[PDB]
């Protein structure tokens, strides 16, 4: 069997990328984390304090508590047939603001602007996204050039 | 016309007496250097234990001191006089320094005293130009740059002009 060691199997997971070792850039500590923020957890081997456990590496959760150095994150974890909402205390070196919602918050403002504007013009504008539709009919101009004929090439043993 | 800031000078003279063992001999050597330089020297311990040399790690075996300024020029003259202002070409390092050995310190005008004895010592001269200190400062350290370094030929050339010395071949 395997060991129950806390950091087993993190040889590559927690190591630093190639030629990106050494000092931690200080903008890592200047990020502002509020209650309700979505953050992606990514353990960093340079700082050994407040390390998330390996199972939380690559997961995204919500901030519920902010201390001087860490935050409390409610992150889902699947254990067999159930998913538990787990609360982990992670130092802010091992997290980053998630962009997963920014595309949504961009759309809301665009939605809220368009909804307001269209209303005062008495017009209807699409607000819901749609899946990419089938391409519509179009013309392809030859420009008096016959398409180049293609043929399969003969086999060649380039051994 | 050469820039005034390119003129060679003696950064320091470094005197070393590797007695090879601790005890009374080393302390006496510490007194020869103090007589010659007028400043208290410092003892250096053995990095490793070596059976053949009979030295144990962290054992004081040598004493040395650095001399700068006008005092370095004065003491260097005594040694170069004992050499008759003759040095070999191989005595110069490729980084622009040189040095020589003295077999008895009494030749340097140090009056013999019964309770000290006779010792030899090394002489090493570190040359330099102004602005060599950028590599030794804490804030905004730098490297002096290729054109400002001192070559073996420039060091030998300086020694001849400065002392009218002779660079023997080999």
């Amino acid at each position: 069997t395997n060991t129950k060691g806390k950091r087993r199997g993190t040889r590559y997971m927690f190591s630093r990328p190639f030629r990106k070792h050494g000092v931690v850039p200080l903008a890592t500590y200047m990020r502002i984390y509020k209650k309700g923020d979505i953050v992606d957890i990514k353990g960093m081997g340079t700082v050994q304090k407040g390390m998330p456990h390996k199972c939380y590496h690559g997961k995204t959760g919500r901030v519920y508590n902010v201390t001087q150095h860490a935050v409390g994150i409610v992150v889902n974890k699947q254990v067999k047939g159930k998913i538990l909402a787990k609360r982990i205390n992670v130092r802010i070196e091992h997290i980053k603001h998630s962009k997963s919602r920014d595309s949504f918050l961009k759309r809301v403002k665009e939605n809220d602007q368009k909804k307001k504007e269209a209303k005062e013009k008495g017009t209807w504008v699409q607000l819901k996204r749609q899946p990419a539709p089938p391409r519509e009919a179009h013309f392809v101009r030859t420009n008096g050039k016959e398409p180049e004929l293609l043929e399969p090439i003969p086999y060649e043993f380039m051994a | 016309k050469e820039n005034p800031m390119r003129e060679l000078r003696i950064r320091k003279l470094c005197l070393n007496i590797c007695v090879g063992e601790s005890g009374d001999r080393l302390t006496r050597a510490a007194k020869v250097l103090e007589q010659l330089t007028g400043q208290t020297p410092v003892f250096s311990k053995a990095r490793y234990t070596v059976r053949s040399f009979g030295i144990r790690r962290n054992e004081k075996i040598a004493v040395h001191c650095t001399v700068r300024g006008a005092k370095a020029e004065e003491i260097l003259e005594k040694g170069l006089k004992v050499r008759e202002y003759e040095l070999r070409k191989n005595n110069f390092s490729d980084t622009g320094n040189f040095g020589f050995g003295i077999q008895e310190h009494i030749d340097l005008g140090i009056k013999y005293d019964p309770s000290i004895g006779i010792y030899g010592l090394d002489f090493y001269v570190v040359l330099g130009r102004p602005g060599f200190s950028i590599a030794d400062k804490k804030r905004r350290t730098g490297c002096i740059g290729a054109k400002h370094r001192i070559s073996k030929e420039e060091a030998m050339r300086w020694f001849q002009q400065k002392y009218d010395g002779i660079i023997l071949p080999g």
Binding site: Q130, P131, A132, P133, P134 | -
Partner: protein, 50 residues
């Protein structure tokens, strides 16, 4: 039937063999039909078929 095919066939409402449905085509749906490729015959019906 493998789990991922079993779910996609249930969303198309094709829970029985030789069941049929219309499916309006787009990126979302065309990629569902690719998962169930071995389990379905599909294509474009003409007006008479409808």
């Amino acid at each position: 039937v493998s789990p991922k095919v079993r779910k996609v066939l249930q969303l198309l409402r094709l829970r029985q063999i030789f069941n049929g449905t219309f499916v309006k085509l787009n990126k979302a749906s065309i990629n569902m039909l690719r998962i169930v490729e071995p389990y379905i015959a599909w294509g474009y019906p003409n007006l008479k078929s409808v």
